[PDB]
């Protein structure tokens, strides 16, 4: 009895202590069980997060009372070497809050459908027993179609059932495919590495039926085009543990503590080993807190600082006191010694294309692909075609390597770098200079648009009898940097203080960073690299990569690393981290995701061109190609709207298309038959004649737009979608907040390749279907919302660029309410489709266009210039001057049996990627045993793909990263090309086979694979480019080396054959609207930056109460104190940010760490929480992408050219966004537009 | 002399990345209930700032901690025993819900249920978790000042700027910020225990964790004022107070706290400290507040000293606890290397959660600078965080121990760079700060590599000692409601018996 | 009337008394977590300092008065003290109480988080205190303490279990009857309201050593 215990008062007194200051008591403490019983739980399950953070962290999911209650990090990753910190615990704050979603008030529990669409669907079914015809009756009635498209984002969702929505979805897909074409059906899902099977689910269904799979890396602007330009690689970088092997690190535009949270300790800890660190960010960012020095260049001007640093480096470590390590490194691993041909101009010369073996008389003894092999001089003044150029990759074998050897005699050679001191004469070459251009918001430095430099040249006698002047990439590079070499070049610097084409004094003006800092750090960095043989590294992120001229910021950082021999050495190099792009077991996953086990090829599309086109953002373009050309280019040969350059790129097979042709591609074969020709030929003839046209030419004619769109693992309409208001108007057909006039309304110049119409087609999408676990902004604007399983309710796999482990997502409990995993949702759709299509689609024949692919022999397309067959400049040759034209048979009724079995092509054809292929029979045999096989039907005898686990096991068994047997066959295939053995890279692990159940017990390190260029080894960490440098495997570029010189016609004409400073672009989005809708408060134009947020991963977790409570309770925008004070804004005041593209409402965060002139609305806060109505649009306030708009760049459209050839997520236009400016002002009326009568007015 | 043990904690601020993961896991586990939804047992503040609750460091305002009277005696700043009771009907210093923030939620269901034909896009507005009413605007939150969120003149009211010429720090180029994660200090001389009229708060003997007994607390709410770190939060629903419990359910079996094991930055260390409980009052009442730090170090005993070992045993400290104390990372950082310092020792509570101060990028200067004593690496005098600010935070204003800590960390870096880049031995920086090479290498092992087994050396709390573990193993957890737990007397009005006990006595002796 | 009289003054006081005690014991043994003062101060500090102190200092004066007055200076001197000292305390109490009640009912944060019992018990003490003060003019009609003698006679018969206690009340003014019943009712409701905090007046604190440590147990 507790009452009776009170009487033992005296009895429970023990000894006093500390001279009477204390008393020890012997009393009951049973109450302590109250907190013990909270901690106790039922079990813990291993899982992870399928979100785009790069974290890839394994967690312990605690189930208590039969419900998921919280999570804590797993700490059992395989430990790293003794001299390196281990990875545990990883984790981040967004991840720690995921459990909140399972039973929260925003969880999606049941399939939902817009009420108006449901009422019509049911009324249509009462009149049309066949669901395809019921869908026809609604969609072909303009009034019916419009009544549900205008209801999008306007309430009225009603509970439906899996049966009802699956039938509608299937009926609509059949109708669309039958009447317009398979490519009018599309799907958008990103980053498969965060949840492989979950991505594969929709991609596989779409691929089987012919629908388009939209890309994401380029669209999100995570793809750095500079990587494919320099290395012929999408992205490959060192792992975070490798930062610990570096002795000098610059974090440049990368907010490590905030955006690479679970890996940040490698950066803080390596400092204790004596590594110096430098932060380069315009604001006082979190990353500055961890470095030894904070440099703050004006945002957008980083390339200028990088050029000046490179200048110092070349001056001091290449010229004045030649570094043995650096010199030998650039001689062997760059295109510096390669020869460039000079073009005659009026009184001077311009750098032309690189000299090819084919240009010389004997073609240098080169019989195979001589026009694709580059040329250098050896140290004995003789010409040579060295091993490794792209011409040696195809049509022959054993010479595609970086052995410094003569491509004809096979003898060892030594390349000479500079002609200086052996030139026949000095020629003057003009270099473009854009540093004097720019807007009023950035400092400029006037010199001349063309800068003349004296280059040492050598005249050569060409094969066609003509003669020509050549110089090396090296010499051209030193001139471009402005290094005086004794020829008394007036445009070369006489000192670092000489304001010239590109000095420390020059950069100080452009960037505002003190020239002595530029000099001191360039020096320290190069010295460190010289001493350690390359252990200097630069970690770089979206702070630099999301600018329109991202390529110049990157090539500047990249040249610094190259000149110091850091790329390819553990502890050194280019460390680009953005989204989670590294799905390690790539070739095991690709066949599953795009049904390549059944049909080849699939329909990949590059999303930036896709949305620029279909959401009609081109109808508002303000940037012209003309204003981006080199001052040395023939302006007349580059006329047209930016969209015209895309259409041309498409018809030349450079970039993919979607929809592809203006006619239903399921009908072409039938017509070819009647005309007496095979489909390919009939298509080419029709294309030459114009009876068949590329759909891109007429995007608004009613048959060339996408009609059904699947969205999953994406919040496209609240996060990533640049030009939000354009998507609402043109794709959705709903009210929108665009403020400006289009090309037509301003009487501007119409495109020359695309039809124009004054009243643009709106509401193009007939059906928007979104799969999610929370009601996101995208769900809010969809027609059908399907409840999906959270990451703690399904099995899947996850990998990342940051570490080498593969680990799983697992179901701690079955999905709650009526939710289903993505895999099960698409399997059920595939199943209903299969029956609904009977009688409408059978065994069909599809004509599919495929662009020329990087890593295929076809990459050797147009060697010396650009010829447009439509201009009659050449014949239409699919696969060379136009896209390949492929025939694909589809068995529509068998879609489900196919989706659920591993197809016969793996056995018939085999597997492969990155230009190599291998036999995979033994794996298919293993798979029949692990997954069991179909007992009957179309796929009888094939391994099954019924569960997500069967799908994961297929990924693991097929990939070389997870199956040592495959790894050895893959390295063997590569060895054929290089003539060097690489199998030794995986022999020691040939017996390794990673299994799904084993990774649930402990995450497993993957195996060294040719798919990648770094090693998974116990003595050296993973470092990108390590195999090129150490195994002599070439980079997949024209020259086989790191390419400093971009000689493609378009690269030359757009002024980017060599890196150069390019000021931020003018989007011209503010001057036409500022002051037009005054609310009485002052307005001011500011640079609108959107770095990634601390309280969410993109928009995921943005609605999470934990994150909202630790942040500022909803959408906010940061402003400097000076700008806020100028505008009368106090901390937390409601403000409105707007421009031509649209408007957004938010609260201000006022701060000293934001420099005057810029504002930061951290990347994505989206549209569902705490947003009042806009005074500009009189609609709900918009989001950050309500003020952006897609503007493509031509250089990112280049195809058919070795390293500049297409690949899904490998190349294509990018969704850059940092150059944007907006008008900012304090709001006055705060109306919530909800009929609650709870509105406010902000005074003054 | 009475030896007691406790698992202490050291947080290396130099490595803190200000991510708050520690705060989210702690909240999910311990304070997601109505009544404490606004309470963050572990919370992280960005400095300069006033923190949570606002200006909690201002003791003239909040009356937390101890004062040393003129006669040499200790008294809670709140008042002596009668002064305290005289304030019981309405604690005049009590922080109100607004000094923390009004907890809020959002109407997400409106996104799901909005009616067809809505004039505008539906949205989820804020609602108070105290009243259930619509909030026109969210005006505050627990981490409102995160990353210098707010005007400098507002953030600079930070009590730690006392005695500092602070204007220069409002200039963009001189900007600085750091992170201060905090939890309860589980003090040797806790002010909360001393200020609770019902005696419901106690320090556990075997492991020093300080708890508020949920049976015995009566809700007098004076402890909240008494705690100078403002780490006791009133549960507005139950009417009782609650605080960080140092995850005793895990510590009891030798596991790290949740906020420690989940620390992404790998900055937290857990290790045993042996202390002389009889010396507590003497140290906490030393006359000069600048001596409290060293006087506390003096109460910590050397675990490898056989005199201490024999006394510990005599005083009941379990052998595995003595052994863990001998490999304690906390003892190395606070006693040997002198890197860890207490948080606000001047409150006189003898805090048991210490901090290694952070390094920072160098200050703005006329040029790129020169090589200093540390070559291309920084010299302590060039760091941009004013050392006096750190000293106000950790050493009662004395910069000497703060400078020694930073300098030593910088010396380790210089020595290691000589080794790993130059491939040479250079102990010059070490010699300057009094470190030996063996010490520097050990500092590097613990701070840099920081293997899991080295960050957490937590022994068991030995629940079997002086108790009956066997019947408890067999019957704990069947919570049918026997009504007999919590008291020592067996008599009970419901005429029941404890489920986890043995009531049939052995008659064979 | 005579029936109601023996019920309320001979029977009812024992019902209330038994419930008060065994309810207090049972809630103490089985309801420790519910045993608290239930402060609402943090939710709304406004006016609490004045109101709670007025209320408590007032009600405690009366408690001392009532206790030593009816359960232990000629009688008329005690009556004089009761009216002046007690009256003044009652005024402080009533002001405090009314302020607390207005707060509990109309301060949104307090009203949103109150229990029904908190409103009920406070409302009844405000009535009881108003009733108490209202008896002053009646006692005034009998300055020789004759009324007080009746009331104390009844109180003392009740606490010593002498039957017939209601006889002592013969002819006392009705208002005293109401005050006695509401007062006893307060005891009956006591173990089921926040009033249990009263049992816990922290007297031990005045002599307790500052630091407390609990041994393994
Ligand atoms: N917590 C969290 N983590 C995530 C994500 C998230 O949403 N949340 N998302 C992922 C993804 S998908 C990406 S693409 C990255 O995180 C982006 O982060 P990063 O730090 O590279 O970019 P960011 O665009 O944020 O820019 C980093 C910082 O650079 C500064 N900055 C901004 N503009 C510039 C500039 O022009 N030049 C220079 N030198 N710096 C600039 C700024 O301090 C910014 O925070 C990554 N992990
Ligand atoms: O309230 C009282 C006071 Cl104050 C005195 Cl003095 C006496 Cl005697 C009695 Cl009976 C009551 Cl009730
Ligand atoms: S959200 Fe990403 S970084 Fe954060 S814990 Fe999850 S996987 Fe790790
Ligand atoms: S998790 Fe660790 S690094 Fe992150 S805020 Fe908390 S203490 Fe600092
Ligand atoms: Mo990204």
Swiss-Prot record, chain A:
Q: Which NCBIfam families match?
A: narG (TIGR01580)
Q: Identify its membrane topology class.
A: Peripheral membrane protein
Induction data: By nitrate.
Binding positions for Mo-bis(molybdopterin guanine dinucleotide) per the UniProt entry: 222
Q: Required cofactors, per record?
A: [4Fe-4S] cluster; Mo-bis(molybdopterin guanine dinucleotide)
Record note on domains: Apoenzyme contains at least 2 NarJ-binding sites, one interfering with membrane anchoring and another being involved in molybdenum insertion. The first binding-site is a short peptide sequence near the N-terminus that contains a twin-arginine homologous motif.
Query: Tell me, what does this protein do in biology?
Result: The nitrate reductase enzyme complex allows E.coli to use nitrate as an electron acceptor during anaerobic growth. The alpha chain is the actual site of nitrate reduction.
Which Gene3D superfamilies does the record associate with it?
3.40.50.12440, nitrate reductase tail
Q: How is the cofactor bound?
A: Binds 1 [4Fe-4S] cluster per subunit. Binds 1 molybdenum-bis(molybdopterin guanine dinucleotide) (Mo-bis-MGD) cofactor per subunit.
**GO BP of this protein:** anaerobic electron transport chain; anaerobic respiration; nitrate assimilation; nitrate metabolic process
- The gene designation is narG
Q: Which organism is it from?
A: Escherichia coli (strain K12)
EC class (word)? oxidoreductase
Q: Which named protein is this?
A: Respiratory nitrate reductase 1 alpha chain
GO CC, any one term: NarGHI complex
| InterPro entries in UniProt | Asp_de-COase-like_dom_sf (IPR009010), MopB_CT_Nitrate-R-NarG-like (IPR037943), MoPterin_dinucl-bd_dom (IPR006657), Mopterin_OxRdtase (IPR006656), Mopterin_OxRdtase_4Fe-4S_dom (IPR006963), Mopterin_OxRdtase_prok_CS (IPR006655), MopterinOxRdtase_cofactor_BS (IPR027467), NarG (IPR006468)
Q: Which GO terms describe its molecular function?
A: 4 iron, 4 sulfur cluster binding; electron transfer activity; metal ion binding; molybdopterin cofactor binding; nitrate reductase (quinone) activity; nitrate reductase activity
Swiss-Prot record, chain B:
Superkingdom is Bacteria
Tell what triggers its expression: By nitrate.
User: Per its UniProt entry, what is the enzyme's top EC class, as one word?
Assistant: oxidoreductase
Binding residue positions for [4Fe-4S] cluster 3: 184, 187, 192, 227
Q: Which residues form the 4Fe-4S ferredoxin-type domain?
A: 7-35, 175-206, 208-237
UniProt-listed SUPFAM superfamilies: 4Fe-4S ferredoxins
What the record notes about the co-factor is: Binds 3 [4Fe-4S] clusters per subunit.
Q: What NCBIfam families does the entry give?
A: narH
Name assigned to this protein: Respiratory nitrate reductase 1 beta chain
Instruction: Please report the organism this UniProt entry assigns to the protein.
Output: Escherichia coli (strain K12)
- Upper lineage ranks? Bacteria, Pseudomonadati, Pseudomonadota, Gammaproteobacteria, Enterobacterales
Swiss-Prot record, chain C:
Q: What is its EC number?
A: 1.7.5.1
Alphabetical GO CC annotations of the entry are:
membrane; NarGHI complex; nitrate reductase complex; plasma membrane
For the keyword Cell membrane, the answer is: yes
Q: Which residues bind heme b 2?
A: 66, 179
Q: Where are its TM segments located?
A: 4-29, 48-70, 75-104, 117-140, 175-190
Cofactor binding note from Swiss-Prot or TrEMBL? Binds 2 heme groups per subunit. Heme 1, called the proximal or heme Bp in PubMed:12910261, is located at the cytoplasmic interface, heme 2, called the distal or heme Bd, is located at the periplasmic interface. Electrons are transferred from the periplasmic to the cytoplasmic heme. Heme may be transferred to this protein by HemW.
Record keywords, A-Z? Cell inner membrane, Cell membrane, Electron transport, Formylation, Heme, Iron, Membrane, Metal-binding, Nitrate assimilation, Oxidoreductase, Transmembrane, Transmembrane helix, Transport
Could you list which ranges are Cytoplasmic topological domains?
A: 30-47, 105-116, 191-217
Q: Which molecular-function annotation in GO is an example for this chain?
A: metal ion binding
Record's bilayer topology term:
Multi-pass membrane protein
Disulphides: none
Known InterPro entries for this protein?
Heme-iron_electron_transfer, NarG-like_domain, NarG-like_sf, Nitrate_red_gam
Induction, per UniProt: By nitrate.
Might you name a Gene Ontology BP term for this protein?
anaerobic electron transport chain
Q: Does the keyword Nucleotidyltransferase apply?
A: no
Subcellular location, record wording: Cell inner membrane
Binding residue positions for heme b 1: 56, 197
Recorded hits in NCBIfam families, A to Z, give: narI
This protein's assembly is summarised as: Dimer of heterotrimers each composed of an alpha, a beta and a gamma chain. Alpha and beta are catalytic chains; gamma chains are involved in binding the enzyme complex to the cytoplasmic membrane.
Q: What PANTHER family would the database entry show?
A: NITRATE REDUCTASE PRIVATE CHAPERONE, REDOX ENZYME MATURATION PROTEIN REMP FAMILY (PTHR30598), RESPIRATORY NITRATE REDUCTASE 1 GAMMA CHAIN (PTHR30598:SF3)
- What protein name is recorded for this chain? Respiratory nitrate reductase 1 gamma chain
């Amino acid at each position: 009895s507790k009452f009776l215990d009170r009487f033992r008062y005296f009895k429970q007194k023990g000894e006093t202590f500390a001279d009477g200051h204390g008393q020890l008591l012997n009393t009951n403490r049973d109450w302590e069980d109250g907190y013990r019983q909270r901690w106790q739980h039922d079990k813990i399950v291993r899982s992870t997060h399928g979100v785009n953070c790069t974290g890839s962290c394994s967690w312990k999911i605690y189930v208590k009372n039969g419900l998921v209650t919280w999570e804590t990090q797993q700490t059992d990753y395989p430990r790293t070497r003794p001299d390196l910190p281990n990875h545990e615990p990883r984790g981040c704050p967004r991840g720690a809050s995921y459990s909140w979603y399972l039973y929260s008030a925003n969880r999606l529990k049941y399939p939902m459908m817009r009420k108006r669409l449901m009422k019509m669907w049911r009324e249509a079914k009462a009149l049309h027993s066949d669901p395809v015809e019921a869908w026809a009756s609604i969609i072909e009635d303009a009034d019916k179609a419009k009544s549900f498209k205008q209801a999008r984002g306007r309430g009225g969702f009603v509970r439906s059932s899996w049966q009802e929505v699956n039938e509608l979805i299937a009926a609509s897909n059949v109708y669309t495919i039958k009447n317009y074409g398979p490519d009018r059906v599309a799907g958008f899902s990103p980053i498969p590495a965060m949840s492989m099977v979950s991505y594969a689910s929709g991609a596989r269904y779409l691929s089987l039926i012919g629908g388009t799979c939209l890309s994401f890396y380029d669209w999100y602007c995570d793809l750095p085009p500079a990587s494919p330009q320099t290395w012929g690689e999408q992205t490959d970088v060192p792992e975070s543990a490798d930062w610990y092997n570096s002795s000098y690190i610059i974090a440049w535009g990368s907010n490590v503590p905030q955006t690479r949270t679970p890996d940040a300790h490698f950066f803080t800890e390596v400092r204790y080993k004596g590594t110096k660190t430098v932060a380069v960010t315009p604001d006082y960012a979190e990353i500055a807190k961890l470095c030894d020095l904070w440099l703050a260049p004006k945002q957008g001007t980083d390339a200028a600082m990088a050029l000046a640093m490179g200048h110092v480096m070349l001056r001091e470590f290449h010229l004045d006191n030649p570094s043995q390590y650096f010199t030998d490194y650039v001689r062997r691993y760059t295109d510096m010694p390669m020869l460039v041909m000079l073009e005659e101009r009026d009184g001077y010369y311009a750098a032309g294309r690189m000299l090819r073996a084919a240009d010389l008389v004997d073609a240098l003894g080169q019989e195979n692909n001589p026009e694709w092999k580059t040329v250098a001089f050896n140290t004995n003044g003789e010409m040579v075609a060295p091993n490794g150029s792209i011409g040696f990759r195809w049509g022959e074998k054993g010479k595609w390597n970086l052995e410094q050897r003569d491509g004809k005699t096979g003898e060892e050679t030594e390349l000479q770098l500079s002609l200086l001191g052996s030139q026949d004469e000095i020629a003057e070459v003009g270099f473009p200079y854009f540093g004097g251009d720019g807007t009023e918001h950035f400092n400029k430095v006037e010199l001349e648009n063309v800068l003349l430099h004296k280059l040492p040249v050598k005249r050569l006698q060409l094969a066609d009898g003509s003669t020509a002047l050549v110089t090396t990439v090296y010499d051209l590079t030193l001139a471009n940097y402005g290094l005086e070499r004794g020829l008394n070049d007036v445009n070369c610097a006489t000192s670092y203080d000489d304001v010239k084409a590109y000095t420390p004094a020059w950069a100080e003006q452009i960037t505002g960073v003190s020239r002595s800092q530029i000099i001191r750090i360039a020096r320290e960095f190069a010295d460190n690299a010289d001493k350690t043989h390359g252990r200097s590294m630069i970690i770089v992120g979206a702070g630099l990569n999301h600018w329109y001229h991202l390529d110049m910021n990157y090539r500047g950082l990249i040249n610094m690393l190259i000149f110091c021999g850091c790329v390819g050495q553990s502890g050194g190099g280019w460390a680009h981290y953005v989204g989670q792009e590294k799905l390690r077991p790539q070739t095991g996953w690709q066949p599953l995701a795009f049904a390549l086990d059944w049909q080849r090829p699939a329909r990949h599309m590059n999303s930036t061109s896709y949305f620029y086109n279909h959401s009609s953002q081109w109808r508002y373009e303000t940037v012209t190609a003309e204003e981006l050309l080199s001052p040395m280019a023939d302006k007349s040969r580059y006329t047209g709207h930016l969209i015209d350059f895309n259409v041309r790129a498409e018809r030349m097979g450079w970039l993919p298309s979607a929809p592809q042709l203006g006619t239903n591609p399921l009908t072409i074969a039938g017509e070819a038959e009647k005309a007496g020709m095979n489909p390919v030929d009939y298509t080419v003839k029709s294309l030459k004649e114009g009876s068949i046209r590329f759909a891109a030419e007429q995007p608004e004619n009613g048959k060339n737009h996408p009609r059904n769109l699947f969205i999953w693992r994406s919040n496209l309409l609240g996060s990533s979608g640049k030009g939000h208001e354009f998507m609402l108007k043109y794709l959705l057909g709903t009210e929108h907040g665009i403020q400006g006039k289009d090309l037509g309304q301003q009487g501007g110049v119409k495109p020359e390749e695309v039809d124009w119409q004054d009243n643009g087609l709106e509401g193009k999408l007939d059906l928007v279907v979104t799969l999610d676990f929370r009601l996101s902004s995208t769900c809010l604007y969809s027609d059908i919302i399907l409840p999906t399983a959270t990451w703690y309710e399904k099995d899947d796999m996850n990998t990342s660029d940051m570490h080498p482990f593969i680990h799983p997502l697992s179901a701690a409990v079955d999905p709650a309410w009526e939710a289903k995993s993505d895999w099960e949702i698409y399997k059920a759709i595939a199943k209903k489709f299969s029956e609904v299509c009977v009688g409408h689609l059978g065994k069909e024949t599809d004509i599919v266009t495929l662009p020329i692919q990087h890593d295929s022999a076809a990459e050797l397309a147009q060697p010396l210039d650009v010829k447009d067959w439509k201009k009659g400049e050449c014949d239409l040759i699919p696969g060379k001057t136009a896209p390949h034209i492929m025939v694909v048979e589809r068995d529509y009724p068998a879609t489900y049996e196919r989706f659920t079995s591993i197809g016969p092509l793996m056995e018939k054809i085999g597997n492969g990627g990155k230009g190599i292929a291998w036999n995979t029979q033994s794996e298919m045999d293993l798979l029949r045993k692990l997954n069991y096989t179909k007992a009957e039907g179309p796929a009888k005898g094939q391994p099954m793909l019924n569960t997500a686990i069967d799908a994961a096991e297929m990924i693991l068994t097929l990939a070389p990263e997870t199956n040592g047997q495959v790894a050895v066959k893959a390295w063997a295939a590569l060895s054929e090309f290089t003539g060097r053995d690489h199998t030794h890279l995986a022999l020691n692990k040939e017996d390794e086979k990673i299994r799904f159940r084993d990774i649930q017990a402990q995450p497993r390190k993957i195996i060294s694979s040719p798919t990648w260029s770094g090693l998974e080894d116990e003595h050296v960490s993973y470092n990108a480019g390590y195999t090129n440098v150490h195994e002599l495997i070439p980079w997949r570029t024209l020259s086989g080396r790191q390419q400093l010189y971009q000689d493609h016609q378009w690269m030359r004409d757009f002024g980017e054959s060599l890196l150069v400073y390019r000021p931020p672009i003018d989007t011209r989005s503010v001057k036409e609207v500022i002051g037009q809708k005054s609310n009485g408060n002052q307005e001011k134009a500011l640079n609108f930056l959107t770095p990634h947020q601390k309280w969410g991963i993109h928009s995921t977790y943005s609605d999470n109460l934990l994150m909202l409570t630790l942040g500022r309770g909803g959408p906010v925008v940061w402003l400097s104190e000076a700008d806020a004070k100028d505008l009368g804004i106090a901390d937390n005041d409601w403000i409105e940010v707007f421009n031509s593209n649209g408007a957004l409402t938010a609260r201000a965060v006022v701060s000293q760490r934001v420099p005057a002139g810029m504002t930061m609305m951290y990347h994505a806060q989206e549209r569902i929480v705490n947003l009042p109505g806009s005074e500009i649009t009189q609609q709900r306030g918009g989001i950050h992408n309500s003020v952006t708009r897609i503007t493509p760049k031509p250089t990112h459209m280049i195809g058919g050219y070795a390293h500049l050839a297409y690949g899904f997520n490998y190349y294509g236009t990018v969704g850059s966004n940092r150059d944007e400016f907006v008008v900012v002002r304090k709001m006055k009326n705060i109306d919530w537009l909800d009929g609650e009568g709870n509105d406010q007015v902000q005074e003054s | 002399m009475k030896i007691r043990s406790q698992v202490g904690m050291v947080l290396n601020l130099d490595k803190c990345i200000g991510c708050h993961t520690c705060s989210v896991t702690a909240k999910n586990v311990w304070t997601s209930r109505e009544g404490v939804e606004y309470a963050w047992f572990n919370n992280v503040e960005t400095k300069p700032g006033q923190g949570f609750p606002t200006d909690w460091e201002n003791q003239e305002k909040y009356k937390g901690g101890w004062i040393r009277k003129i006669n040499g005696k200790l008294q809670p700043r709140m008042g002596n025993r009668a002064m305290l009771l005289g304030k019981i009907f309405a604690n005049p210093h009590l922080p109100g819900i607004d000094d923390y923030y009004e907890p809020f939620d959002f109407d997400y269901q409106n996104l799901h249920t909005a009616p067809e034909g809505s004039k505008s896009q539906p949205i989820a507005r804020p609602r108070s978790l105290i009243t259930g009413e619509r909030m026109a605007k969210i005006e505050k939150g627990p981490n409102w000042e995160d990353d210098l969120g707010g005007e400098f003149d507002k953030l600079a009211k930070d009590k730690n700027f006392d005695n500092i010429q602070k204007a220069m720090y409002s200039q963009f180029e001189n900007t600085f910020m750091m992170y201060l994660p905090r939890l309860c200090e589980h003090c040797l001389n806790p002010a909360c225990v001393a200020t609770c009229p019902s005696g419901a708060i106690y320090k556990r003997e075997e492991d020093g964790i300080v708890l508020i007994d949920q049976d015995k607390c009566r809700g007098w709410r004076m402890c909240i004022t008494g705690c100078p770190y403002k780490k006791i939060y009133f549960n507005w629903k139950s009417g009782k107070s609650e605080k960080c419990i140092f995850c005793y359910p895990r510590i009891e079996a030798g596991q790290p706290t949740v906020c420690s094991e989940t620390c992404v930055g790998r900055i937290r260390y857990l290790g045993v400290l042996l202390y002389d409980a009889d010396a507590i009052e003497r140290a906490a009442s030393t006359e000069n507040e600048k001596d409290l730090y060293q006087r506390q170090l003096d109460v910590f005993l050397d675990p490898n000293d056989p005199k201490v070992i024999e006394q510990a045993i005599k005083d009941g400290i379990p052998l595995s606890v003595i052994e863990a104390a001998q490999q304690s990372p906390v003892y190395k950082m606070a006693m040997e290397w002198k890197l860890a310092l207490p948080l606000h020792p001047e409150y006189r509570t003898l805090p048991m959660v210490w901090y290694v101060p952070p390094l920072s990028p160098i200050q703005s200067a006329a040029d790129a600078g020169e090589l200093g004593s540390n070559g291309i690496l920084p010299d302590v005098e060039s760091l941009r965080i004013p050392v006096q600010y750190l000293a106000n935070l950790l050493t009662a204003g004395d910069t000497k121990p703060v400078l020694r800590a930073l300098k030593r960390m910088l010396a380790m870096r210089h020595y290691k760079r000589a080794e790993t880049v130059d491939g040479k031995v250079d102990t010059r920086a070490l010699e300057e700060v009094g470190l030996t090479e063996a010490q520097a290498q050990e500092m590097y092992r613990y701070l840099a590599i920081a293997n899991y087994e080295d960050r957490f050396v937590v022994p068991s709390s030995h629940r079997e000692l002086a108790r009956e573990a066997f019947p408890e193993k067999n019957g704990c957890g069947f919570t049918f409601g026997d009504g007999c737990h919590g008291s020592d007397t067996k008599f009970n009005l419901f005429n029941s018996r404890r489920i986890d006990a043995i009531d049939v006595t052995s008659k064979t002796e | 009337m005579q029936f109601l009289n023996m019920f309320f003054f001979d029977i009812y006081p024992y019902i209330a008394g038994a419930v008060f005690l065994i309810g207090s014991w049972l809630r103490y043994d089985y309801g420790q977590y519910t045993w608290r003062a239930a402060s609402s101060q943090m939710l709304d500090r406004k006016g609490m300092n004045l109101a709670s102190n007025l209320f408590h200092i007032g009600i405690l004066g009366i408690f001392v008065g009532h206790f030593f007055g009816m359960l232990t200076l000629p009688i008329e001197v005690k009556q004089k003290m009761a009216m002046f000292a007690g009256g003044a305390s009652g005024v402080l109490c009533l002001i405090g109480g009314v302020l607390l009640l207005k707060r509990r009912l109309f301060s949104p944060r307090v009203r949103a988080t109150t229990t029904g019992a908190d409103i009920l018990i406070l409302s009844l003490l405000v009535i009881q205190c108003a009733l108490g003060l209202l008896t002053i003019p009646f006692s005034a009609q009998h300055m020789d303490g004759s009324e007080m003698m009746k009331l104390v006679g009844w109180a003392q018969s009740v606490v010593t279990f002498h039957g017939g206690a209601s006889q002592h009340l013969d002819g006392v003014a009705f208002i005293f009857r109401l005050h006695l019943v509401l007062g006893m009712t307060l005891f009956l409701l006591f173990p089921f309201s926040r009033l249990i905090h009263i049992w816990s007046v922290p007297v031990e604190y005045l002599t307790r050593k500052y630091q407390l440590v609990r041994a393994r147990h």
